[PDB]
Amino acid sequence: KRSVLCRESLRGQAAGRPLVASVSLNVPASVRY
């Protein structure tokens, strides 16, 4: 968990073709937009 106290917040989702694209790879792994 990472503290979200300041102005820094800048997360909200909206891309061109992809939207809420979840990756699972044999090596790496993640969640985008």
Partner 1 sequence: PQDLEFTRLPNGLVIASLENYAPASRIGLFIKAGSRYENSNNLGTSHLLRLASSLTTKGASSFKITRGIEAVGGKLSVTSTRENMAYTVECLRDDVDILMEFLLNVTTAPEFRRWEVAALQPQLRIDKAVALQNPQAHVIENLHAAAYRNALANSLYCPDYRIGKVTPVELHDYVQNHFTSARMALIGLGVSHPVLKQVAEQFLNIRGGLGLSGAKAKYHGGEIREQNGDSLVHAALVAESAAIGSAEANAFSVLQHVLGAGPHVKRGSNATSSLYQAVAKGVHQPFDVSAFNASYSDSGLFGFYTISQAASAGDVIKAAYNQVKTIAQGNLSNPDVQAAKNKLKAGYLMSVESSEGFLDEVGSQALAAGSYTPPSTVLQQIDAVADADVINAAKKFVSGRKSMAASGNLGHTPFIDEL
Q: Which amino acid is at 3?
A: S
Residues touching partner 1, count (CB under 8 A): 29
Give ∠ CA 25-16-14 in degrees, rounded to 5: 85
Smallest separation, CB 18 to partner 1 (Å): 6
Smallest separation, CB 16 to partner 1 (Å): 5
Q: What DSSP state is assigned to residue 21? A: P
1-33 binders of partner 1 (CB under 8 A): 1, 4-29, 31, 33
Q: Which candidate, 7, 28, 11, places its Cα nearest to that of 20? A: 11
Which residues here bind partner 1, judged by CB under 8 A? 1, 4-29, 31, 33
